[PDB]
Design goal:
7 copies of one chain form a homoheptamer. By secondary structure, chain A is an all-alpha fold. In chain A, 67% of the residues lie in helices and 0% in strands. Chains A, B, C, D, E, F, G: Residues 10-33 are annotated as: Disordered.
Chain lengths: 236, 236, 236, 236, 236, 236, 236
């Protein structure tokens, strides 16, 4: 006939908790202002993704309620200070370890969302109009979940990008020790022919690296779409 | 039953003031005419963004009013003068510090708008047609707010671009001191073989740098979309 | 109740004169035929923009009339002659100063149009169907004004482009003095081995520069869209 | 009241003759077959543009008639022979002067069409449904005229392109005199080591230049859109 | 009144024969298999274009009949054998002369179709609904004719492409005489150090040239659209 | 009157057999696994094309039946083993001859389909609604046939691509004989300085060639569209 | 008449089991974290594809049921530890053999799905509305199956990509043995001039290779579309 028990089991399965998203807060990789902006952009994007996940959770409760109603349809139930400032900022911070932890957490969440779309599979023994409509609704929830996983992945991708940017800038930029060297070796009045040249070259490379850093550390915000409305089935 | 108190609390939350946008006026980085044009373009774009923010504020008041009405639905409640002119203009101004302050303010505003979309989350305990319609309206307001944050970001991005352009032009262009040097060292009649060559090279590089400056300092205007109309719910 | 005085004040504000567009006529930067074509294209585009501005002015009068009617709804109220020709033309004219004056005027007009969209802001105290419709109409006028400002900007951009093209061609092309030199130094029969070589090189570079000049001096016409029709509100 | 005289004056203004298009027939720049094809393509495109201009003239008469009817609505009123052939063809013809005359004429026509859209401006003192409809019709005619001017411009652009192609090919291709030289200097049996090399190089460059010439001289046809139908207003 | 004679004259003009398309059959430029494929592709495309031209001819007869009916509405009326094979094929055939004759014929047809759209011009003295509809139908026929001319042009363009490909391959590929030379000079046992090197280089260049030849000689088919249906006007 | 005999003749012509597609099975050019995959992909694509050709044959029978009914409407009728493995596989197989036979067959089929669209030409003496509808149906069949010919061409193109890939890989990859040489010349303990270098270079080039081979030998599947449904005309 | 037996045979043919998809689980090619992520992404994508294949199987059962009903319609029926860590991870794992086994299995599945669309061919002897509708439904199932085969192919393609990435990284990155060498040869205090240079170069190349590895090992998820609903035919 009609297997109400299959429908009830599927209703409990569809609103079971999914994976818990990460909650760690990523810190700025360095002391540069663009780095702090990037870290704050990531934190805000993470908060917004968590918020929309709670919205999806509500949609799944409503879908489970509709399934239970559908089941009940059957039966009863030259000074160096600019260079020194740039270098000091660049070598401060944690150099990206918290970014990597952030990215790992969000990649894990990506994968664990992807593993959890079994709960939206089609029914074995249920058929008819209500079953078709509920399957369409579960399919929509599945699509939204996959989109959310993709957003989680893009979040982790941006965090990894920030970590690699920090490394690239750190090996492309004159060290604080090199700047202290160049300054002192400019305190002696025999090398000027060389030190002044080196100062100009450092100051060049520094402006160049920092311009690269400032533009590439401008992260896109992540806005999650709201989950599609669950199908509503009133109690009999 | 129906939690009117949740709706009233959400109505007060949705029309609470958001972050205040920055009001500082960015100055031209140099004395060049294109720089002044760019600064004025930025000032006008900032004014226009502030104006549309006031429009969005009105839409949020109307949305709060509609929520209060919906709640009441339940119960009672060769001369060097061209070179000298070019250099003098290029080294005048504040060299972009007010642009950087402008950009910082607008990036902060970007982030603080992004942090303030909690006020548009779905309802916990409210359901039905009015709740669905009000959620759709809040979702629209949220979308508009995110677009406005994106425009704020683009504003700050343009200001940062102007600051970097000023630096690039300043290290790519012969100094006023170098021009005074070249002129004087051309006042002595032994070096002509060299000074005339150097004059032509300077004048080349100067035209080149200034053409770059004039085209890249042509900033796009920013026109904000008007906020979507709030849903209207009449009093019972 | 309903503030008729706000509506009447807004009606007077919306049809107040806007900035006056520039009327100066840009001259050809040189004697080349493509330069004259470019100057005439600019003059025609400027005339067409001014014409459409008058159209927009009429639309704003009609909008003000509709607002006054809406207010009344409440209560009572080898020879060198080709080279010598090319050079002589290239060094004639004003070399682009009138183009720069033209561009400055049109950039100023761009900015002053952008500053004048306050007159289309939403109403504070007016609400209902007529207010919504009038706000939509003002929004349309605002959009058209911003498009017109963008066209003004593109006009100034083209004029600046012509000035820079004139400079580029002038420093890329052999001078009239250099051609007179090469000719005379070819009047003596000892240098032929050199002068004939130099003549061919000049004639090369000249064809090259003039082909560049002729294609890049082909300016797009500017056709302004007509302003959207104002909303019509009949007197009561 | 209603100014019939304004409408009648505008009716006479809208059907006044516009500029006369050029009628000169462009000749092939050289003797090459692709050049003759290009000249014939240009002649056909010019004929087709002139034909559609006559169509637009009829539409303007009909529009003027409709305006007069609308006014009456108010009151009473190794051998060298392949090289020698290629060179002989390339140096024949007029080398592009008639192309330049053609292009000048069509650029003048472009500009003079652009200057003649005043006749489609909105009305000062006429209003209502018929006025709106007639303004829409005049706007359509204006759009068609601007498109026709753009086509005229593209026609002149192609003619200029053909002239520049002729120059480019002429300075990129071995002269007839150089070929006669190479042949004769190959009649003496001491230089073969050199002349045979030079023959192969000429024959290379010649095939190369002629392939370039043949593909770039393949001109797009110009098909004018027919003018939009004038609005029809019957006599009262 | 109504000029029936104009309509009848236009009916005879519209169904007069147009230019006759060429009927010559293009031969393969060489003995290569890709060349034979290309020639057959061209022959088939030419046949298909001729077929659709006959279809258009029928549409013009029907249009003329409809015009006559509309008129009657008023009143009564290392071995070298792979190299030797490649070279022998490449130097066989007519080397592209029949391709050039084919292309000339089809370019002439292109132009003569373009010259023959006068027969679709608007009417001078005929007006009303039938005239508008017949003008729309003639306009459609004109559009189809222009598309057919464009297809004829593309046909000639492909034939010219094949001829140029044959030339390019012939001067890029080792001659049969050079291969006989290399073989014989490899029959003597003193040069091996050189001949074996040269054999490998030839065999390289030969594979390279033939791969180029085989891919570029893959011609697109030409499918003509069928002509739009003529408007049908029944006899009175 | 109405020529039924023309319709009956066209009905017999439209369902006459078309060309028979090739049935030969293409073998893998080498022993590489990607080559076997490519050959199997080609075999499957060929089978699928043959299947859809049978579908089109049924559609043509139905169209002929509809034509006969329409006619009846009138009257009565370092070890070297990875290198040795790679080389041994690369030099096995038939090196692409069966691919070339396959491609020839499918190109012939392409052309012979293109030659066989006469059977869908418009009618001479048949007119009216049924004739128009049957012509539209024949036009659709013609379009499908041209698409099928294009798919046949793409099939042959892929086979040719595989043959050229086999040649490219074979001359870009160290021979089995060269690998046996390098190994043995590494069996003697005097050359190591050289042989080890050569081994690394071979192993490099081999990985490089095989990666190229594996990615380019990944062939797209060919899915034919089903033929459009024939028009149905019931018997009178 | 109507061949019910053909329909019943086709119903049994359409729901016969298709090929069984592979079930092997691909392991990470190395010890890098991105490699583990890639392997897990592949495993999840494989699981999701298998799930949708089960969905398609249900659709084919329903289609077979509808066919049986349609049949019944007729009758009764400087330390080195970062380098040492990087190298140790890179050389761990199986270096991609399980990826290659995975890819082979999924390519086989691709091909075997492509070979199994005979079951959706059109009917020989069945005609009418039900036959047309069932053919459309089978065509849809065929389209879905081809899309699923394409997804299987993309799955195998990604696995092959991971294997090639592992090889590329392994020959682009300093060996663990080379790092042990460089460290020890830095334990002796005579070579520093060289070893320190080599350490910096290794550390460079290592960061470079690992950044490449981490970004290219970021695999797209594969989301299969759900199969189109089978046509429903109720029993008579």
């Amino acid at each position: 006939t009609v297997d109400q028990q299959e429908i009830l089991n599927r209703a409990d399965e569809v609103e079971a908790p999914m994976a818990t998203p990460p909650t760690d807060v990523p810190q700025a990789p360095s002391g540069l202002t663009a780095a702090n902006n990037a870290a704050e952009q990531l934190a805000v994007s993470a908060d917004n993704v968590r918020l929309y996940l709670q919205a999806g959770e509500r949609e799944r409760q409503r879908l489970a309620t509709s399934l239970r109603n559908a089941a009940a349809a059957y039966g009863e139930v030259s000074d160096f200070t600019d260079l020194k400032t740039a270098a000091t900022k660049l070598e401060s911070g944690d150099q990206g370890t918290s970014m990597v932890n952030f990215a790992d957490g969000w990649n894990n969440f990506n994968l664990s969302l992807q593993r959890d779309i079994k709960r939206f599979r089609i029914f074995e023994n249920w058929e008819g109009d209500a079953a078709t409509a509920c399957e369409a609704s579960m399919d929509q929830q599945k699509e939204w979940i996959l989109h959310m996983a993709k957003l989680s992945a893009s979040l982790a991708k941006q965090a990894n990008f920030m970590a690699q940017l920090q490394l690239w800038a750190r090996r492309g930029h004159p060290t604080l020790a090199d700047i202290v060297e160049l300054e002192r070796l400019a305190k002696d009045p025999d090398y000027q022919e060389q030190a002044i040249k080196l100062y100009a070259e450092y100051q060049e490379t520094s402006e160049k690296v920092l311009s690269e850093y400032n533009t590439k550390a401008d992260l896109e915000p992540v806005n999650p779409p709201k989950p599609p409305a669950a199908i509503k089935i009133d109690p009999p």
